[PDB]
Symmetry: C4
Subunit: 188 residues, 4 copies
Amino acid sequence: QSETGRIEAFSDGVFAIAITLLVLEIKVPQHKIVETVGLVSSLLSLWPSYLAFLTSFASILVMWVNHHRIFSLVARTDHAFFYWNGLLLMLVTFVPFPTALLAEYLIHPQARVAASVYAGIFLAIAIVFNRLWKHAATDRHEVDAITKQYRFGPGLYLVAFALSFISVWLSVGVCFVLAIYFALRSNA
Amino acid sequence: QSETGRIEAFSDGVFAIAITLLVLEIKVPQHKIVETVGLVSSLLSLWPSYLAFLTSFASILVMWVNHHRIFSLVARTDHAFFYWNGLLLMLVTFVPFPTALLAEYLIHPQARVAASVYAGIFLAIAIVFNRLWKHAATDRHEVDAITKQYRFGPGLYLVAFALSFISVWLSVGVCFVLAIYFALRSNA
Amino acid sequence: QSETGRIEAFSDGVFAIAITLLVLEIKVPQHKIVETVGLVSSLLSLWPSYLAFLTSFASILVMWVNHHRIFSLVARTDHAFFYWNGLLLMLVTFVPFPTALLAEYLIHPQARVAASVYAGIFLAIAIVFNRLWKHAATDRHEVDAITKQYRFGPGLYLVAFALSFISVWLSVGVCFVLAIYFALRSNA
Amino acid sequence: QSETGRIEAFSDGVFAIAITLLVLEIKVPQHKIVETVGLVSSLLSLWPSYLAFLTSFASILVMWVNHHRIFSLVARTDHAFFYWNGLLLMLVTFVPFPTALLAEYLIHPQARVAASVYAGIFLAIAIVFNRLWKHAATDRHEVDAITKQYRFGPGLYLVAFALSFISVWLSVGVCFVLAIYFALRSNA
């Protein structure tokens, strides 16, 4: 109630502000570039910003859903529970930077780093979801599905993290499709 | 009831942050340009920013009203409903960008491009409203009146969308007046 | 209760974001300038940014107090009340831009343009408070004291507004004193 | 209850926005610098940004919890208590600026000015918490511990603050350890 409802309320606000801050990274094309190539070729060349904004928005929504699900189940709060949640908020607000980094350097040669730090923050959040839930355990079917799912995540985002080093396109691809899949298995 | 109030709550917060973010697009006039021509002529030359901010703020407010209106009616959320809602939040958080583009390039020659994407995203938002509401449809006369309103919008924004190609001024105007019209018809 | 709690709530969130965005206008001193003159003289020359951030923050807080008092006392709501409230939100979210102008050009020659546009937006918000409440008529002692304060405000901000033309220092001064005064009269 | 609950609600929203605004100061490295030296050396050279962001995020979380503790214990609003809380919101919204100043100039020679303005805002918040809570004096067992801790902070941040003048490294360091420590003593 107050102990858990206050924490879940605060977390909901920080999630909302993180999600909406994503738009700011999308920068209107400069007057110079549009003057030489046309506003259209410019707004088009902005496609990885759209891509990064979109997949990152989507993934953060999934995080809001999972966060609410965990919070509905048990009402005891621990000191370390409060702080594991606090890190989770921290990585959520941090997501805009790897997003912006990724949109800025997706086409360019050192893109593999951009992709890796991106999948990094996502894997890192996944690990933190997993640890956050691990503290609670230590509806049977919901608990089981949740334990099973949060142990299923960090590995797959580790797969995205590792895939980054081989090629950018493959890593960003598995983050997009992985956002669709995790959205689907998240149970709204 | 409580779960729909939770999803509606998150959506209302994303609206508050989106609407307030709009102010950031209005850029204080540069020291150089103001230095040769004067603060007054500069703050005046900023008028398309005033215009885009005002119409975009007013319209997003109307979208908030309509969102709440849909949400009050029935308390049964599906995954697909939650996601129609989620995509709706994404286009709302995205609105500041077409806003900024429109303020920046209104006076300039490829303005029509900006204008269309402006009406474009709004048309897109209208469409998602419809789809979201269409999933609900599947006091009944009021529901019918709402279906008629949300079906009357997107065609008209295809018109505001299409008007963009003929001339910037006529399309953006039709977005101004059309925002006011939906403000009233939406009935607070 | 629910209707004014919902409208008042949404306006409450938009207020918090307007207030906090103020911090973004304070811009850390650039590397080129700080290298020639030293970090202290630069952070010092930023003083009108501190000044505008401070008074505007105070001002938006007092406006938050007034908002909550109006909403708490009577719960009946009209469409036209909702829209006076909407314009009131629009001017509130707009506050950061004139804050930024005022902070930027306080030292420089056309400061009087900035100061007048500043006192302007505050006067305008005052007028909109007045009109929002006027539509309410169209605790009785609180009603009387409130109407007397809302008569007293817009005239005094017209005094600050007109003072802007004679000298920047005097207009900004009456805005600072006026924020402390209205804070003392809102009676939180 | 309703006035303290509403006031606490507004204060918490300002906290959430302050904390998330923190990300914007981490600026994705410019195209030029990355093009001569490589993305990795650039993302690494950004580490004082990660440092200032991390310590400020953690510290602001702590201020959120301590704010919540003061508010839950006694619920009776005065004007002057409302204003002490108001100043406390202002400094919290001000936290991003000293954070960016600190991230930007940690490596540089006059870092000591940045560092001292950093610990300065933090100590200043400590003082404001101290007076905020002292407004209560002018269950019981907890009240004693809180007065001891709140009288206990501002001196220790005076220590971090004085430490800035001897060396940047010691000042920011003791702010780091001080953020972790106050997290634990706050009994989250």
